[PDB]
Design a protein around this ligand. Structure first.
Ligand SMILES: CCOc1ccc(Nc2c(C)c(N[C@H]3CCCNC3)nc3ccnn23)cc1
Length: 283
């Protein structure tokens, strides 16, 4: 721990402060001080995460439990998708690069999901990019590990009070990010839980028992919810092509059981001509 020299503060998450740091191995790392001894379950869960290694998952290099505090040492990347989106706002991310990033994030999700590990908190600031065209998921497994946060990417079954949600929650979040790369605007930018739900309802239709069996018995479902009609995706994500719109529609299925899995999404015709472009990055 005295083994690291802070370089600068680079971020601030739900789980504490993040610094760029140098390991006195020579390596440059992202160091996360976990907000706080450490409960023993958090330890064994995080220890499990160190083994969950994939090219599209930010590598957990080390887990330092000392002085009764917890530090997570991560592989360092120089940019995130939020900043890249803000920088690309004038002409948009080119479609082939959108498709490459979506494809790679679905590979990362299919990996974690096959081990029954969920992210739960996907958002642009958690997706990190390098000069080689790679994109990686940061903070995977941390929500389960530890128990204004953005609601924009939160799945409707969470907002409706489901306690035992599934890997489908990460697919919803990724479809929301896909729509945002395409249109250069957040799809559902809610500033309260009801505003988030009602934005979803205004675009996708108020869900009912027809499209989502069991919806009306959910913990926070209210029969008094206004009933809005569903919009056409051609209005929601222009100028995305029909393969893209078709894939997005399956990622945004109301019923978590009908929503497409990461593994099935990888086979969708949208990915038939996928390539790996390199972005233009100013670091
Ligand atoms: C171009 C300046 O922007 C940057 C600069 C550095 C980063 N790097 C970074 C940042 C900012 C980061 N921040 C965390 C903050 C809390 C939520 N999850 C991500 N985590 C990691 C892990 C590996 N790299 N990294 C991201 C964006």
């Amino acid at each position: 721990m005295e083994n690291f020299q802070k370089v600068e503060k680079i971020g601030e998450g739900t789980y504490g402060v993040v610094y760029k740091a140098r390991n006195k191995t020579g390596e440059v790392v992202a160091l996360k001080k976990i907000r706080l001894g450490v409960p023993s379950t958090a330890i064994r869960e995080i220890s499990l995460l160190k083994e969950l290694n994939h090219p599209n998952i930010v590598k957990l290099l080390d887990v330092i439990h000392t002085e009764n505090k917890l530090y997570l040492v991560f592989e360092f990347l120089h940019q995130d998708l939020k900043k890249f989106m803000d920088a690309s706002a004038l002409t948009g991310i080119p479609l082939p690069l959108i498709k490459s990033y979506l494809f790679q994030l679905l590979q990362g999700l299919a990996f974690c999901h096959s081990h029954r590990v969920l992210h739960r908190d996907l958002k642009p600031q958690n997706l990190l990019i390098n000069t080689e065209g790679a994109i990686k998921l940061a903070d995977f497994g941390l929500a389960r590990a530890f128990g204004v946060v953005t609601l924009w990417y939160r799945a409707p079954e969470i907002l409706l009070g489901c306690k035992y949600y599934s890997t489908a929650v990460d697919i919803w979040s990724l479809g929301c990010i896909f729509a945002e790369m395409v249109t250069r605007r957040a799809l559902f930018p809610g500033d309260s839980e009801i505003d988030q739900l009602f934005r979803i309802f205004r675009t996708l239709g108020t869900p009912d028992e027809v499209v989502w069996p069991g919806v009306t018995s959910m913990p926070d479902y209210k029969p008094s919810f206004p009933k809005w009609a569903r919009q056409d995706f051609s209005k929601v994500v222009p100028p995305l092509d029909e393969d893209g719109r078709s894939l997005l529609s399956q990622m945004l299925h109301y019923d978590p059981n009908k929503r497409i899995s990461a593994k099935a999404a990888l086979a969708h015709p949208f990915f038939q001509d996928v390539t790996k472009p390199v972005p233009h990055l100013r670091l």
